[PDB]
Amino acid sequence: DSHQLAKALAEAADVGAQMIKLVGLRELSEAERQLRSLVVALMQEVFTEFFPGCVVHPFGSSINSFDVHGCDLDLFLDLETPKEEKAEGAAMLELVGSILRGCVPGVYRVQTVPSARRPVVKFAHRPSGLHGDVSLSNRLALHNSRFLSLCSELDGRVRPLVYTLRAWAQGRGLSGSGPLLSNYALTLLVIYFLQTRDPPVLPTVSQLTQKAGEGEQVEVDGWDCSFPRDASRLEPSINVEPLSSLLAQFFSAVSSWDLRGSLLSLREGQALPVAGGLPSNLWEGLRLGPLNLQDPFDLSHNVAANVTSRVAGRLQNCCRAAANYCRSLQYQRRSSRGRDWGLLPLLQPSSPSSLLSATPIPLPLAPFTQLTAALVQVFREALGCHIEQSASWRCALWHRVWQGRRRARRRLQQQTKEGGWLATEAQVTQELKTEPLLSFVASVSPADRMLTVTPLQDPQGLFPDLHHFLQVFLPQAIRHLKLEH
């Protein structure tokens, strides 16, 4: 596809046409949906044989309109009370597993996951080549999937935006299993972005809840899931901004936002100040961190709560870079013949140097001023860097200093047999030995305190080595400098 898709997007008229074509290409065909329906029908048959009156509800990527090729098939099986109710649940889970493993034909790789936040049973159907999860209870997943598809129905730009930004995110390494953003979290971030535009593209979940209607009220796990089943009773958006504009605006927005001190509410369509303690007092069980994104229904759940500060910072970095790219003429204007334009450089893999310079380096806690002073102390001395003027400095290195420190250290130890930090490391540095060999930039943001090291001039391409070496070296430096007190 990486060939076919590339030339397909290259031939498009404009950026919007590229995003639309991207949706058209990545989404499940009719045969894939028929196949998934077949599998769901089978699971339904067997589970019916076991649990009379049970209903297998497809949820997630399948029904939320954000479906892509090879996506998971997620199924929800609908059928003195202490913590034991957890154990009971687990039991039932295994029961379901034992049904999947030995009863329904052609399903293998059956793996019970009671340990997960939301308990689930992984499975793979062999003939269809499909895989996914059976959840005994996640009821909210249904309703917020319906909410996603409804959001797609509310504005036609939603699907192109979300598809493009998902592709970009997985291309920039912002989405995955680790403390990366989930596709659902990223989708909710896009929806939040669309809700926060000056004319709103999408309505808030509060407004949809108000829209409601008789009998359409629904409550799950003590949360209000009620929203209209169709978009016909809902007035359209007067925001006329074209797709490319909304994309650039996304990048710029999430790059300019304050994530640490903001819980992003899709319900109220607003940024609620985190510090101190305000949203935490209302809905208990809300874990706050580098990125805070509130579920539209369960308000005690931060969907991004898993994301580490390095990942959030990397997000904002990549978004600043992408916004900077969209400001160019390569993004706006098409190419005469064969050149990469518009969406292509965004969906193309990022250089290893950019790959590293996007994700910052976590530094020990310390006063911003004292920390920055410590850093310029570590670059000035203990490193051969010539330094000059969130705080940022331009640094120039004429030397190989990151490499061969071990040999100089050995030499200095045996020559110590002959006869705290800072200057002692500066010995190791200066004993390692006019256009600069490598010139780079070091930036420390207020929140969190982290160093973003980006290259300027790198003729021989040595920047990644310096970056990894600094990843190891700078925390040690700040550490011993903290221990001098």
Ligand X SMILES: Nc1ncnc2c1ncn2[C@@H]1O[C@H](COP(=O)(O)OP(=O)(O)OP(=O)(O)O)[C@@H](O)[C@H]1O
Close Cβ partners of 137 (under 8 Å, ≥ 6 residues apart): 76, 89, 119
Q: Of residues 104, 246, 259, 303, which one binds ligand X by CB under 6 A? A: 303
Is 141 one of the binding residues for ligand X (CB under 6 A)? Answer: yes
DSSP string, 54-94: -EEEEEGGGTSS---TT--EEEEEE----THHHHHHHHHHH
Q: Is 325 assigned a ligand-binding role in the annotation?
A: no
> Nearer to ligand X by C-beta: 72 or 78?
72
| Best CA proximity match to 72, nearest among 3, 132, 156 | 132
Is 271 one of the binding residues for Cl ion (CB under 5 A)? Answer: no
DSSP string, 255-304: HHS--TTEEEETTTTEEEE-TTTHHHHHSTT----SSEEE-SS-TT-BTT
Is 253 one of the binding residues for Cl ion (CB under 5 A)? Answer: yes
Q: Is 61 assigned a ligand-binding role in the annotation?
A: yes
Q: Which residues inside 170-189 make contact with ligand X, applying CB under 6 A?
A: 182-185
* Residues 62-101, mask of contacts with Mg ion (x by CB under 5 A): ----------x-x---------------------------
Taking the complex as a whole, how short is the minimal distance between the CB of residue 378 and Mg ion, in angstroms? 46
Q: Is 33 assigned a ligand-binding role in the annotation?
A: no
Of 53-61, 153-161, 197-205, 400-408, which part binds Mg ion (CB under 5 A)?
Answer: 53-61
Helix (H/G/I), strand (E/B), else coil: 100:
helix
Q: Is 133 assigned a ligand-binding role in the annotation?
A: no
CB atoms within 10 A of CB 243: 19
Taking the complex as a whole, how short is the minimal distance between the CB of residue 83 and ligand X, in angstroms? 22
| Best CA proximity match to 266, nearest among 178, 147, 142 | 147
Taking the complex as a whole, how short is the minimal distance between the CB of residue 254 and Cl ion, in angstroms? 8
Taking the complex as a whole, how short is the minimal distance between the CB of residue 63 and ligand X, in angstroms? 9
CA distances 207 to 229, 379, 481, Å, are 14, 53, 53
Torsion angle of the four alpha carbons 73, 78, 84, 88, in this order, in degrees rounded to the nearest 10: -80
Taking the complex as a whole, how short is the minimal distance between the CB of residue 339 and ligand X, in angstroms? 32
Is 72 one of the binding residues for ligand X (CB under 6 A)? Answer: yes
| Best CA proximity match to 203, nearest among 299, 254, 267 | 267
Q: Which residues inside 52-71 make contact with ligand X, applying CB under 6 A?
A: 60-61, 64, 71
Q: Is 301 assigned a ligand-binding role in the annotation?
A: yes
Q: Is 306 assigned a ligand-binding role in the annotation?
A: no
Is 61 one of the binding residues for Mg ion (CB under 5 A)? Answer: yes
Strand pairing class (219-220; 107-113): unpaired
Taking the complex as a whole, how short is the minimal distance between the CB of residue 118 and Cl ion, in angstroms? 32
For the four alpha carbons of 203, 207, 208 and 209, in that order, the dihedral sign comes to positive
> Could you give the CA distance from residue 434 to residue 370 in angstroms, rounded to a whole number?
32
Taking the complex as a whole, how short is the minimal distance between the CB of residue 297 and ligand X, in angstroms? 10
CB atoms within 10 A of CB 203: 20
Q: Is 166 assigned a ligand-binding role in the annotation?
A: yes
Is 292 one of the binding residues for ligand X (CB under 6 A)? Answer: no
Of 29-37, 122-130, 143-151, 245-253, which part binds Cl ion (CB under 5 A)?
Answer: 245-253
Element holding 8 (H helix, E strand): helix 4-10
Is 111 one of the binding residues for ligand X (CB under 6 A)? Answer: no
Residue 253 partner contact from Cl ion, ligand X, Mg ion, none using kind-dependent CB cut-offs of 5 to 8 Å: Cl ion
List contacts with Cl ion (CB under 5 A): 253
Task: Give the annotated binding-site residues.
Answer: 61, 72, 74, 144, 166, 184, 301
Task: Give the annotated binding-site residues for ATP.
Answer: 61, 144
Task: Give the annotated binding-site residues for Mg(2+).
Answer: 72, 74
List contacts with Mg ion (CB under 5 A): 60-61, 72, 74
